[PDB]
Design a binder for these strands. Structure first.
Lengths: 46, 271
RNA sequence: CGCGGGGUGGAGCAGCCUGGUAGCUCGUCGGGCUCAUAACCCGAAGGUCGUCGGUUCAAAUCCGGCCCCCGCAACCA
RNA sequence: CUUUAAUGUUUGAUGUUCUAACGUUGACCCGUAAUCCGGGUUGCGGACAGUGUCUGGUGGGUAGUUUGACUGGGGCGGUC
RNA sequence: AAUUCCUUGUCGGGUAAGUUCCGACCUGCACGAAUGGCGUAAUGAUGGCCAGGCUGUCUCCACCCGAGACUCAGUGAAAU
RNA sequence: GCUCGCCGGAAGACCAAGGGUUCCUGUCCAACGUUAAUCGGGGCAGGGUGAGUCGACCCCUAAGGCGAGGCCGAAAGGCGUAGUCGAUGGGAAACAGGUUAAUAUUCCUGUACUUGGUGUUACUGCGAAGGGGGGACGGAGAAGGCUAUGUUGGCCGGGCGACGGUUGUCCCGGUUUAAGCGUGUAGGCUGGUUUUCCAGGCAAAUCCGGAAAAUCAAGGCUGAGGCGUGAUGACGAGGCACUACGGUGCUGAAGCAACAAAUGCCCUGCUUCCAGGAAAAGCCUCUAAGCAUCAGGUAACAUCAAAUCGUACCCCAAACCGACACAGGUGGUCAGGUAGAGAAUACCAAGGCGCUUGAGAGAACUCGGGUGAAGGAACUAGGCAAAAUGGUGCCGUAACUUCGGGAGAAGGCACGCUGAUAUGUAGGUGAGGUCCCUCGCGGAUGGAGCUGAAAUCAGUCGAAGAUACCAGCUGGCUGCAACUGUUUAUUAAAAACACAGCACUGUGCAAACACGAAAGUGGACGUAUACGGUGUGACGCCUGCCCGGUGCCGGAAGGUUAAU
RNA sequence: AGGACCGAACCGACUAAUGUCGAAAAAUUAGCGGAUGACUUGUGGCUGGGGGUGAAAGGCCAAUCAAACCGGGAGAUAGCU
């Protein structure tokens, strides 16, 4: 079947990337929450 | 001209076209062409506000000089064009000084005709003049609402607005729907009936014949579940409700008109 | 099996509701009108109020058993 | 007390007219190479329209809930 | 009748035999005119029925060819 | 290594995506592999990715995103102008051969091209966020001209061949060659040139456009392929020479013709129909604000620069996505031989593999299949499944019909091979020779060679000549629905939905309506032959009666009636 | 010319068998329907939870839909086990 995940780094980096977060206020807090938790996999990038 | 094609296939056995031997078959005049981004019926939000709108075929927009500000200039009609945006035909007119412009083609207009505008113009089909210079009882089209606006009344295929009476600063008109309406005298109007008057006799025939027009399948309310439409539900086709729009607003007889700021202009409501 | 309604001159229907006097039309009889019938006009007779019993001063009427008819219901596994 | 007439006064409800509020998704100019917008001329409407507060009506478009128990299973019928 | 409860209604045709089928009669429990009525060539991986043709579906199964099943060596689960 | 078998429009060879060293070499076998394992996409160590011409970055935009100010909103924030980003779109420029354990249109050899700076020489007016041209475009259909490519022949080289034959019409292998430059053809498009004038193009204009005239009949733009050249170069079968015996070094003949021919190219063409088919920049060109002994531009030459990143390997799969070395899913390109209408299909070439548990047995029973006497649906809910029909040309073909169909209806006849008509016809292609000329890639004529259906007659073989693979079951009555189509991804594909058509009703434009606390958008850069909602659902004959109840519309005198 | 006809690629998914601790969390084999169109597909965007989308099944919205997933109200409440 056509699995529900056909990977494409452009789309993944555009709707889930570092800059996509730093755009809106809600996105800023997502980075903020993760930093308080101390997760190294901060976002999805290289 | 109206022609009923031969039933050589299912779907074709009902198609009636209006084939005009006067239309220029070549490419349109590039200078007056600009892109036309299709909407699909969605607003700024992207949500579908107007349904059944989308798909269709890519059709380029041709600007048209509805205003007709060039006055006292003897212009010559060059060739008739096909406009995918308007039900009526558009005549490409060439001005005396060398400027080419599109105009809504009237009934009695062919290649090589002469038309002029302004208050100078004579009473000849295709000419444009301020309505207080036109004899009452006559018929015009592409009528303006406010002076200098551009023209908004009777612009479709085969439509015409006949002037009834003119009492000085205001002109009384009988619109196409049978709606008596007033309008200030300084407004312009183009003489004659709008051509391609047999457009209403065009039966599309196929289902897809609506698909490449932009029309999208419309689902009836009696075939929907109660959480999707006020109508619907029932085990085995049942209606029993008072006919309404998808949002509860009564249809099949219900006046939704409520403007009041322009109620002063209406002399008679249609019947 | 249960619920509601009904049964009234020959026929089709009111009046019961809130008890004491039963009405309308057609039909019938007799008369008149016409050459004769019909129609029309005049007058009159005609109803154990389904049946039985009880309550009541008084019952078509209030209540109950039963007989006949009509409708609804007779469902869920 | 009733019916009433001239005047003065008091506000209310209509009709016509005007321009100054306001509107202007009419034309024109500038800011500005920008169809947003603002300011300025002018034309057209006009104390309307529309907005706020209060108020009556409609209102399953929308939301929160009710929708009994006994019962020789429950429903129906009956009962409290 | 995609509707008819009663009902496998009654008559005719089809079959040796037809509760389904086809054509009719009206006694329409409870068809019906845009929640459309009656027909309709073509079309339909559609529903019901008949005939020809063709066959292991069946009368009644029989044999054979490969893959497992079986034995041996290696690996080595699961439900409970 | 010798045989066997399988795919071969893939199970082959390359990219993007996505993975991230899985690529190659040495070495190791505990853990991974469903078996052992000196094997491996497993562990450890080392090596490998070389670009001015490929792509990205870059120039320029689409859908759309962000959005100085601005508008609007309790706040968050929303919308949007100028701008600025965003390819799957457009825009400058390279091919052949050789070489590695692995990379190469990137390295070497040979031969070329493009965008700019600086300087020199000779000329000359240059110059924008501005104007114009161009870029720049749809579907389908048919033909012509060619090429990739294939076959045959000529020719070169080798063999003459382990059971009968084969010096001959015998056999096998090879017969490969680009980018660029010049020529500018088959073909397509279009009348050029010169003078004058102008309310046209937010200003200007010598450019575009329009309006008058003269002169002459062509000039110009675009254009695959061919022929030369690139190249007495490379390559090249086969020998000659050294073996760590894997391969390296050396040398090297023929290298043309004919025909068939693409879904590729000319063609981003031409004709035709309609539903009527991006934008901006690069480039060309005209000027304004200005600058002129300048600065700049055109042409030639010399020199310099062309940076940063990716580049290995897999890419219809054991490396992507599916927990797995998983019978599934994954866009684009090239794509040969015989048969065949074909990318079907059968068997093969190139190329790559035998699917990572095996060995014996031959029971019931289970799955995939072959055949089956006599009967032929008697089976069963039901002809479910199997069986059967199956191609081409011709003959012939009903009810009914909207006169299109129905229809490939049904039902039939001939199909192989050989000779002959004809040492291969009709036809296609077409050199030499002859002639002319506005002399070249020309035209008439000419006809060898090559290639090649089909029709007929005659003869012959088998039970069977569409023999295999591939390849309709047909007819009759009738319900529903018109029809193509769409739907419950993972039990329901239909009578359900849609449908063109018809009707009703709403909306006069700051339109109704919808999203949105608002602005603002969609509706529509449309405007009543338009647009929203609803009901029905082709076409034909029609569509009766009721306004009591409910809803809606119209008129408001009277009663009643909130806030004030 | 054709929502034209037969039929591969491609897309879809009607019948039967197998499979159901499967090779597979709906596939395979043998047969099917459409196949110039209302066609299909690649890449890239817009619409979002009482909302989106829908040729309309109460189907789909990351294997979950008559109201998605994750965190928090919250150790919700439970005359029930």
């Amino acid at each position: 079947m056509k699995r529900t995940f056909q990977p494409s780094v452009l789309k993944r980096n555009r709707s889930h990337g570092f800059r996509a977060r730093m755009a809106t206020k809600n996105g800023r807090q997502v980075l903020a929450r993760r930093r308080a938790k101390g997760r190294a996999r901060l976002t999805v990038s290289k | 001209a109206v022609v009923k094609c031969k039933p050589t296939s299912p779907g074709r056995r009902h198609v009636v076209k209006v084939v005009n031997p006067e239309l220029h078959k070549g490419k349109p005049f590039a200078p007056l062409l600009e892109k036309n981004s299709k909407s699909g019926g969605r607003n700024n939000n992207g949500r579908i506000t107007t349904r059944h709108i989308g798909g269709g075929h890519k059709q380029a927009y041709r600007i048209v000089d509805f205003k007709r500000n060039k006055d006292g200039i003897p212009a010559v009609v060059e060739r008739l064009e096909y406009d995918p945006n308007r039900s009526a035909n558009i005549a490409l007119v060439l001005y005396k000084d060398g400027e080419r412009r599109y105009i809504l083609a009237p009934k009695g207009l062919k290649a090589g005709d002469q038309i002029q505008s302004g208050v100078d113009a004579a009473i000849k089909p295709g000419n444009t003049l301020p309505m207080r210079n036109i004899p009452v009882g006559s018929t015009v089209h592409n009528v303006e609402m406010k002076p200098g606006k551009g023209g908004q009344l009777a612009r479709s295929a085969g439509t015409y607005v006949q002037i009834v009476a003119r009492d000085g600063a205001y002109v009384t008109l009988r619109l196409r729907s049978g709606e008596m309406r007033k309008v200030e005298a300084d407004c312009r109007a183009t003489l004659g009936e709008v051509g391609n008057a047999e457009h209403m006799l065009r039966v599309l025939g196929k289902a897809g014949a609506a698909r490449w027009r932009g029309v999208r399948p419309t689902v009836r309310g009696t075939a929907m579940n109660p959480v999707d439409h006020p109508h619907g539900g029932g085990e085995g086709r049942n209606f029993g409700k008072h006919p309404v729009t998808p949002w509860g607003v009564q249809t099949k007889g219900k006046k939704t008109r409520s403007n009041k700021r322009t109620d002063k202009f209406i002399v008679r409501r249609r019947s």
